Structure formats: C-alpha cells, structure tokens
C-alpha cells in the first residue's frame, strides 16, 4: 500500500571519489540511457503504489533506479566504476527477476542494457 | 571448529535471510514443482536445508567440504536453467554474497 524510502544517495561514512571513468559513467553512459525513449519507468524508484503492485517490494528488497544512480554520481558516492556498474546490474536484474520474459518492461530493460553494454565497452582508461 | 561454526551461524544464516533464498532452502520437489526432467539432469542435488543439517550435525571435515556443497547447489541451478533466467539471476545474487563471506573466512 505504501512505497519504502528510496535508496540513499550520499553517505558520510562512505569514501568519495571522482575518476575519469566515473565522469564517463555520468556524462556519457547514464546520459545516453536517460534520454532514451524506454527510460521513463527506470528514472524514478519503482512506484508500487501507482502501479498497483503490492508485491513488488515484498519480492525486491534492494531496489535501484537511474535517478538514484544519477544523484550518487553527482555526489561522488562511488569509489570506482565497478560500484556504479553494480547498481546498473541491480536495476536490470531486479526487472528481469520480477517480470516475465517478453513483458514490455523487460523488452524495454533489455534495450537499455544493450546500449549500456555498448558504452561500457569503451569505458576510458583510468588516468 | 571455528571455521565450521562460522559457516553455520554467519554464512548459512546470512544467505538464508536473503531475498532470493526461497528456491534454495529445501531440496527441489520435482513432482510438486512439475519438473519431470530435473533429477534426470541433476545427479547431485543440494540445497541450503541439507547444508544446514550437515553443519549442525558434524558431517564436514573442514570448511572446504562445506564450500563444495554450496558450489554444488549453485551449479545445479546454473546447469538446469538457462543463463539469464530469473532463477539463475537469483542464484548469482546468493553466490556473490557467499563469495564475500567466504573471503572473510
């Protein structure tokens, strides 16, 4: 009936860092996925209330969306690119585990992930 | 002793509480789940229920044997289900949390 609090976007205990890879994950990778036509259901955290999905947060316990990833990158939340990529994987994985293969939301997530993999292939060398 | 009790009260209890743990907490009931070809393919079944019963009943000789049963459970899921399947992704989340706990043995 209610949505849980969103994932954190900053943490004083977590060491902050800004690298050219993390800059590329914000300026190139995330910007490309964000501007995509299939991006609108992945921009904010999954609103189980408006979608009439009482079971979504009974199944998914580690939610993730691109808005959370966007704030974390802007707040230098990640120490390296792997941690940021791991949130992307969590966002896609959650969608594949909760929904059926062939659903609209899964076809949409599969298209975003393919473009995501296209940019990750050319992630710059850490300088 | 210290390594076998750590796998029972820390490793097994952490994975048991995980969100994606319910398919792996008990042996696969292929008759109930309507999987007639499961035990034709999986010749070494393993689950968290039996691993729990082996730790609290002194069945392992060292921590390495307990890691084998965990890998056997993960393998039997990666063998029977297609890569990228929902159930496979759930098993990869458990294994990642498993390799993070074993790394701090």
């Amino acid at each position: 009936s209610t949505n849980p609090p969103p994932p954190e976007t900053s943490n004083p205990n977590k060491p902050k860092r800004q690298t050219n890879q993390l800059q590329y994950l914000l300026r190139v990778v995330l910007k490309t996925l964000w501007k995509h036509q299939f991006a609108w259901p992945f921009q904010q955290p999954v609103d189980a209330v408006k979608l009439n999905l009482p079971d979504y947060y009974k199944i998914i316990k580690t939610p993730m969306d691109m808005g959370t990833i966007k704030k974390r990158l802007e707040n230098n939340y990640y120490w390296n690119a792997q941690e940021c990529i791991q949130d992307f994987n969590t966002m896609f994985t959650n969608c594949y585990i909760y929904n059926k293969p062939g659903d609209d939301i899964v076809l949409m997530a599969e298209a975003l992930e393919k473009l995501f993999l296209q940019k990750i292939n050319e992630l710059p060398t850490e300088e | 002793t210290n390594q076998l009790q750590y796998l029972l009260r820390v490793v097994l209890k952490t994975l048991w509480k995980h969100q994606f743990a319910w398919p792996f907490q008990q042996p696969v009931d292929a008759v109930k789940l309507n999987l007639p070809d499961y035990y034709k393919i999986i010749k070494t079944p393993m689950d968290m229920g039996t691993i729990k019963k082996r730790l609290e009943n002194n069945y392992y000789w060292n921590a390495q044997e307990c890691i084998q049963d965990f890998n056997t459970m993960f393998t039997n899921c990666y063998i029977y289900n297609k890569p990228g399947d929902d159930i496979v992704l759930m098993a990869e989340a458990l294994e990642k949390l498993f390799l993070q706990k074993i790394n701090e043995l």
């Binding site: 259901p41 979608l51 999905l53 079971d55 979504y56 009974k58 199944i59 585990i97 909760y98 929904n99 059926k100 659903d103 609209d104 939301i105 | 319910w22 398919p23 109930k32 789940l33 929902d86 159930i87 759930m90």
Partner: peptide, 14 residues
Amino acid sequence: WKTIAGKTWRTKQC
C-alpha cells in the same frame, strides 16, 4: 502473472 518456485505475484504487465 509470474511464478518462481511456488511463489506467484503480479507483474507490471498485469
């Protein structure tokens, strides 16, 4: 609707 290991829930599609 989706079923995994006995547990069933509503997907976004329904």
